[PDB]
A paper describes a structure:
The enzyme IMP dehydrogenase (IMPDH) catalyzes the first committed step in guanine nucleotide synthesis. IMPDH forms stable tetramers, each protomer consisting of a catalytic domain and a regulatory Bateman domain. The enzyme converts IMP to xanthosine monophosphate (XMP) and requires NAD+ as a cofactor for a complex multi-stage catalysis requiring rearrangements of active site loops that close around the substrate upon binding, and then must reopen to allow release of product. Finally, we show that filament assembly tunes sensitivity to GTP inhibition by stabilizing a conformation that reduces affinity for GTP.
The complete image processing workflow applied to this dataset was also applied to the two single-substrate datasets. From the ATP/IMP/NAD+ data we resolved many different structural classes, three best-resolved of which were: the filament assembly interface, and two different reconstructions of octameric filament segments. We determined the structure of the ATP/IMP/NAD+ consensus filament assembly interface at 3.0 Å resolution. This D4 symmetric region is composed of two symmetrically opposed catalytic domain tetramers. The interface between tetramers is formed by the 12 amino-terminal residues of eight protomers, which each extend from the core of the molecule to bind one catalytic domain on the opposite tetramer, in a shallow surface groove formed by a short helix (476-485), two beta strands (51-63), and two short loops (355-360, 379-380). A key tyrosine/arginine interaction (Y12/R356’) anchors the attachment; mutation of either of these residues to alanine was previously shown to abolish assembly, both in vivo and in vitro. Residues 1–7 make mostly hydrophobic interactions with the catalytic domain, and an embedded arginine (R480’) is positioned to hydrogen bond to the I6 backbone carbonyl. These interactions are reciprocal - a protomer extends its N-terminus to a partner and receives the N-terminus of the same partner, creating four pairs of symmetrical interactions at the interface. The overall surface area buried by a single interaction is 2,300 Å2, with a total buried area of 9,200 Å2 for the multimeric interface. There is strong density in the both the IMP and NAD+ binding sites. We have modeled these ligands as IMP and NAD+, however because the enzyme filaments were actively turning over when flash frozen, we have likely captured a mixture of substrate-, intermediate-, and product-bound states.
Author numbering:
A (entry chain B), B (entry chain G), C (entry chain H), D (entry chain A): 1 to 110, 234 to 420, 437 to 514
Amino acid sequence: MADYLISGGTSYVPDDGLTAQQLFNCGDGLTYNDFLILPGYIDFTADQVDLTSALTKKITLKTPLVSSPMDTVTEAGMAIAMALTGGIGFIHHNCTPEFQANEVRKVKKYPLASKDAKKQLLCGAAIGTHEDDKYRLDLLAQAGVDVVVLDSSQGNSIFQINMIKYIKDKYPNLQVIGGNVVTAAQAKNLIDAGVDALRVGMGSGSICITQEVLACGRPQATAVYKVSEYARRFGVPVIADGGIQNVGHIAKALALGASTVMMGSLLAATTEAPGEYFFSDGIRLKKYRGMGSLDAMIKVAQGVSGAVQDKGSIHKFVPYLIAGIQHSCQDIGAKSLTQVRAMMYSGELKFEKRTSSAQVEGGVHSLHSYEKRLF
Amino acid sequence: MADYLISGGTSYVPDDGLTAQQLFNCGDGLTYNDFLILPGYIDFTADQVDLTSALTKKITLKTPLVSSPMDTVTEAGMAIAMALTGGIGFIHHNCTPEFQANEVRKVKKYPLASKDAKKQLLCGAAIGTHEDDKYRLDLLAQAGVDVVVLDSSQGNSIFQINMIKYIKDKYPNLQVIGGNVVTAAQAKNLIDAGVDALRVGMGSGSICITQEVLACGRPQATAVYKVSEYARRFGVPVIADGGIQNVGHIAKALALGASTVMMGSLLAATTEAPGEYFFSDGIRLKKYRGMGSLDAMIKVAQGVSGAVQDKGSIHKFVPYLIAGIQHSCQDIGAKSLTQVRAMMYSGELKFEKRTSSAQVEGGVHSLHSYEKRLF
Amino acid sequence: MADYLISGGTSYVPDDGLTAQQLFNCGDGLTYNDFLILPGYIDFTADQVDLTSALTKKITLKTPLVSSPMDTVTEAGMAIAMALTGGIGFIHHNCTPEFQANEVRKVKKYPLASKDAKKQLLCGAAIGTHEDDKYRLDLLAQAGVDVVVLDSSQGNSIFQINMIKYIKDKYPNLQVIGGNVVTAAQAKNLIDAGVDALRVGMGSGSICITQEVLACGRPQATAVYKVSEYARRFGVPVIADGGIQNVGHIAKALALGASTVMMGSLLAATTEAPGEYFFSDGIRLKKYRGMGSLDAMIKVAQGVSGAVQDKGSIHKFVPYLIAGIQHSCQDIGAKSLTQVRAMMYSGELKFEKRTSSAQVEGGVHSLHSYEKRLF
Amino acid sequence: MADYLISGGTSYVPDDGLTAQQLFNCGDGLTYNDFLILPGYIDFTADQVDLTSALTKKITLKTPLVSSPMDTVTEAGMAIAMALTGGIGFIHHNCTPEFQANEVRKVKKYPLASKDAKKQLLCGAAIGTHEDDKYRLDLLAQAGVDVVVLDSSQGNSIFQINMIKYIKDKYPNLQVIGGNVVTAAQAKNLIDAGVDALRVGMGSGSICITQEVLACGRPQATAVYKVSEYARRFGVPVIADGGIQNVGHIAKALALGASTVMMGSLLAATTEAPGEYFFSDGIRLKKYRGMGSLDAMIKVAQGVSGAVQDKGSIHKFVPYLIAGIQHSCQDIGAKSLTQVRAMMYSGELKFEKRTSSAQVEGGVHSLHSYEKRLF
Ligand SMILES: NC(=O)c1ccc[n+]([C@@H]2O[C@H](COP(=O)([O-])OP(=O)(O)OC[C@H]3O[C@@H](n4cnc5c(N)ncnc54)[C@H](O)[C@@H]3O)[C@@H](O)[C@H]2O)c1
Ligand SMILES: NC(=O)c1ccc[n+]([C@@H]2O[C@H](COP(=O)([O-])OP(=O)(O)OC[C@H]3O[C@@H](n4cnc5c(N)ncnc54)[C@H](O)[C@@H]3O)[C@@H](O)[C@H]2O)c1
Ligand SMILES: NC(=O)c1ccc[n+]([C@@H]2O[C@H](COP(=O)([O-])OP(=O)(O)OC[C@H]3O[C@@H](n4cnc5c(N)ncnc54)[C@H](O)[C@@H]3O)[C@@H](O)[C@H]2O)c1
Ligand SMILES: NC(=O)c1ccc[n+]([C@@H]2O[C@H](COP(=O)([O-])OP(=O)(O)OC[C@H]3O[C@@H](n4cnc5c(N)ncnc54)[C@H](O)[C@@H]3O)[C@@H](O)[C@H]2O)c1
Ligand SMILES: O=c1[nH]cnc2c1ncn2[C@@H]1O[C@H](COP(=O)(O)O)[C@@H](O)[C@H]1O
Ligand SMILES: O=c1[nH]cnc2c1ncn2[C@@H]1O[C@H](COP(=O)(O)O)[C@@H](O)[C@H]1O
Ligand SMILES: O=c1[nH]cnc2c1ncn2[C@@H]1O[C@H](COP(=O)(O)O)[C@@H](O)[C@H]1O
Ligand SMILES: O=c1[nH]cnc2c1ncn2[C@@H]1O[C@H](COP(=O)(O)O)[C@@H](O)[C@H]1O
């Protein structure tokens, strides 16, 4: 009878909110803490949200947290902790090739464990783009790296396209990560070159000053939406880096179309981070450089050198991140991240822009003094 | 792997077209032959499209074609033909009450057959709104009418609300058809009164001049969309009358949210139409009056008296109408009318506005002479 | 110095007009005689405009005029005249398979000549979609047809995708024409199936009533723009049929992104058209049926049967069409049709919408009596 | 074949971003750090970007960095350093005429060297507008100044037009710099007066308070776009001053249509700056006054007096600025500044607006403490 015969299954569900296409075609450069996600319907508990998310076309992870190839964030002790909790790591290329191959060998021998066909835990390693970096890839492949990141500030070079053509005939089983891209044109110029997964976002890092120096980049959330919108046409996941201070930005990045979220500062200064601790004004903190900083080794500095206070160990930290992600996906109303992105591209999951006074009341306000403890 | 993990099930499906909400909020008064439906995907043959569509909250028909309570369109010989091919009829109230009760008795004794629980074919009968028309309803209920139409040019009266309150306590099993409404406010003021199904559209009849005389009404397709949009919130089907010359307007009316389509001129001058034929200039044609014409029996004329050439019998005519509806629902890409409306309200089924030169090339053009034969 | 150092090469060139993307995102359903092309700069004569335009991914023609597979427009005597003047023909499938294979054999044995590698003039032949039409393709391939048209009113069926998968492994050198499509979604669902060239436009034929009957289709010029916009992403030409009464609509269709223009009524009633002439009211005219008319051989009629007055022979007619196309491309300001489409997609070639009174003064007006002779 | 015959040369290149005309017609007053430039395609190294940019209609420089005629920024020791690294200087007019003529004589006798026909390095000198300043120009022409700046807060006076008419008949080979203009109307009222190059921007200086005092001016980037848009119609370069703290604003100013960038505070407190150093709270800093400050020599103050910490010498500083400009032009994707402006006015180079939270994450964030070293 009529209660099914008019529409069928779908109830009314009023039209409060903006969809993602309506939000990112107003022209404004929205970042993470500039919009938010409207809630939906809950019919499931929090702990039964599966965070299965693809890294490349062939590589699938159990949780979408991947780390960033920076010489103060990832080495072997980092990648074992990221892969052991279900993510993946990327050993930086700011060292000698035998050192990077040694560390990839170290992590590859060694619950949600993210292991390959031969039951060893996964590992990635970023390479450069210059001609001498073809020798690094042949040392990383002998140690058996599973995925490589063509680490560059600008991903639309003829050099990176030539490197992708160099990899996709000498190693047909190896997965490559093209980047960095922010616009859909340079997404096109890499997906036709054979990239298995893009890496979106330039300028919005916690240490990047390349928007302040080179006048280039774009706001982060618009990049994550408008590259993933193009990249799902060809079945290519994207990776969002930079701009993450908290678990809310991870949920926003996953909701806008990113598959995994790459984090630099939020995993910096852990126990598994390279380097060691030192004290400044009584606060235990570990230093955190950028790749384009002039502490890399007439040159321009696309980054700064700084320090971050510690946050303990990762095995007590990324459980908080994954628990925050499933609570956010509960309040959104989807049982998986795939269902989050399906509800977003289907127009069901609706967003809303957030003004400046709305931002300053979204946080902590109207208190004399507070202490913010997250877990 | 990634081909499911980004979106899942839903492919890309580019964003060509306007949805119905984007189409009917431009402000323009679009009618039937002023927009059209963009096609979709076919994975089914034409003849397996089921046209099951609700008439009221309790009454379900097998095909959405219902007839109009006009004294030159429906009597017993009409209603047996409409119910016998799966629709329903409405015996007009432009006669004495014993005549209408006699004809409803005649049709109720007497494939897709539209029969009740006691296996007799369904029948409706329109009543007035004045106080003496309470005696007509008590004669039609003794003959056992299944649904009644509160036939009025303006459906938001206190008189019609009082008649609905009079019916919904003396006959709790009887179904009522409130109308005519064109705006969502008078949809609200009847659905809270207890109407089982609305009847949308004033002024857009083939013989109505009440837009030209009383300056009231609205364009038909916008009425059918904006009342059905309100009426599906409460599980109330709507009926669209007027403006139909062809099977294309039936498909457009069903796609915009109407459940059944009421037709006056397209079933006028059939063999089962009341009256008899006469010849004028060698063309066999049967006359067709309007209810608000001054040939009803200081008064204003809300209708004209005219004539329509014949179209044979209904049992060879409504097979053409239902075959046109399933071909249109094939080209749209939905297996049922319920799926058509679900794709429309879900934003999947997309429309496009059509300009004046687009209308004049949509029909027949650039020929010396042609003959248009439909079946 | 500064006259080159500010911009370089590009002069000012003020911003009068609308680009094609700005024109076909206002939402309106623009057809051919509803907009027009703003002129540009001339630095070349008319006769040195080359009309080289691709039919499929592999087939290239010398002039973009192709004919339509209709049983009153194309047979062998038509296809020899179309191929002999540089176009191509498509022998209709409204006959027995041995008759169509015989006529394709007849045209394949037999200046701008459009010939293959073996120096015989090209020929196409439309096939159906049903299972028994697999036997027609194997008879047309023995006679050596160069391209086939999957002739259908709706090109997004599972049946046509299955036919394309059936052709693209049994005949890897054969070219297929998918259609008919009007929206970019069904362009996607065929280009991934392996179509070499799309055929855009439904409803806008000179004899189609399928917008008036099945409530489906879209205005023609918006279809030609929005499918070619999607189809040039994958290097797939499109073919525009219907809506052409004159050489102006051919120039508008080629400017919006179509590569070749398929014409039904404008080549009907020629000397090379099938059938024979007859007189009605003293005018020599030849009949012209539609495929969906009920004169094909419970069924709906998607077309009408009519007649067109004669226009002589093609060898005196298509020189007028190609001369009109190069005069239009002169006034636009591009030396080739490829340069027309490059100027259109680059935003250089600008358009302007045209209102109803602008249409009625664009034609002939303010005269007592006139005679319109075109060549 | 078809891969060239549809469009030709131009690939798809999706439509992500806003062009400059779409950006500066939203009405908002965008400045430098309020939008940014989307990247493009790289097929060239950084060091082969030529920064050849015109100063006037006749004067061409090798790098677009010019200095500002302020009595604490430019004297002879400044202009030799600016011209020696390829730019040009402007000796201020806040002194006696014999002193300015002496210093212009000093700089004119005395790699990318910016030299005239007689192989001496170029020099400019600003003059006033009052009647006694006609005597300054006749002393500067005897020492042989190559270009003069009519230094004024408002460039649309009858006084400055009379001075331009006074110069362009007594010195037909001398180049004049009209300014300051911010709107296209006062660009028109000077270009018809005979200006060889405009000087755009009022109020947006690092020491100007004339927006806070005289309620006049406009945001800087909109001025640089909307005067250069008018000025390239007549082949007139523009010079952008004020609002520059970094090399990113230089790249944004050059991308919006400026030919050279005039900088006041970014070259203040160098070794070649006039005056001498002093210490305040342990930081070596040199004072930096404004021309409209009441330290010029009932009057209103259009400027403030302040101080800037040192940045070393220019011969180690402007190599950083030019290296930042060619890295920015690499990431944009153009081999020259002329190609940057050609891609901008052609609609190829696309921009994007940047919100407030996008600005606060574009810089350094989420760190405990950092040190920002640029080279
Ligand atoms: N958030 C971001 O995306 C971002 C932004 C800025 C910097 N960074 C980091 O800063 C690091 C350095 O940035 P980068 O791109 O300048 O490093 P890079 O060494 O890859 O680039 C150096 C320059 O050389 C050019 N190049 C590439 N291949 C070349 C070749 N064969 N020959 C000559 N030149 C070649 C590049 O165009 C570039 O201008 C990167 O590792 C990146 O991770 C990241
Ligand atoms: N397409 C349309 O919707 C449309 C438009 C115009 C006319 N019509 C047809 O024309 C016919 C006549 O139209 P109508 O509405 O004027 O018929 P009606 O007899 O119902 O209305 C007559 C007038 O009396 C008023 N009325 C209702 N109840 C009353 C009561 N107890 N006491 C006093 N006045 C009362 C009504 O407001 C109306 O002004 C209708 O049967 C209708 O079918 C239809
Ligand atoms: N301008 C246009 O695009 C246009 C519009 C209308 C009609 N036409 C012409 O009208 C002709 C007839 O139109 P048509 O599409 O109905 O012809 P058709 O025979 O191809 O279609 C007949 C119906 O059968 C279905 N079909 C396809 N394959 C099938 C299969 N194996 N089994 C069962 N059903 C199958 C189709 O969906 C369709 O509903 C066409 O040749 C076309 O050229 C063209
Ligand atoms: N970013 C900027 O554009 C900006 C803004 C404010 C101030 N400034 C600086 O401040 C300095 C002083 O500004 P200013 O324009 O007031 O200096 P000014 O001496 O040129 O102007 C003084 C006033 O006299 C008027 N004037 C010009 N010629 C005159 C004449 N023959 N007779 C009488 N009056 C005449 C002017 O209109 C002005 O009101 C300028 O050197 C300028 O560089 C720059
Ligand atoms: O030196 C730099 N300048 C600008 N961006 C950088 C630099 N080094 C790394 N990045 C990017 O910053 C990301 C991490 O930033 P974060 O997550 O904000 O801390 C990395 O994944 C890189 O993409
Ligand atoms: O007299 C009248 N004036 C205006 N509308 C009328 C009149 N009589 C009937 N109608 C309406 O016209 C509809 C049928 O019109 P048609 O389908 O266009 O022929 C009926 O269902 C009534 O709603
Ligand atoms: O029967 C029909 N109904 C609707 N469209 C048709 C029919 N037959 C052919 N067509 C289309 O009409 C086109 C030619 O129409 P014309 O060029 O306007 O004369 C053909 O190429 C077909 O795509
Ligand atoms: O006194 C003043 N008030 C406002 N603007 C000034 C003044 N003096 C100089 N300017 C402008 O400020 C520009 C330099 O400012 P800056 O580059 O922001 O440091 C100069 O080129 C002048 O156009």
